[PDB]
Amino acid sequence: GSSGSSGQTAALMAHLFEMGFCDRQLNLRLLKKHNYNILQVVTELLQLSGPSSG
Secondary structure, three states, X not given: OOOOOOXXXXXXXXXXXXXXXXXXXXXXXXXXXXXXXXXXXXXHHHHHOOOOOO
């Protein structure tokens, strides 16, 4: 399973859970991609879901 100090992942992941995102698998990928940039992590998610594709 996951190893290492508590870290600062749950903190961010939480926000998403509240906002309206229940995908811990998705967020993670973003967290370790946009330096845990809640903004970038969210802004991106919003794009994926919705008629806004092209």
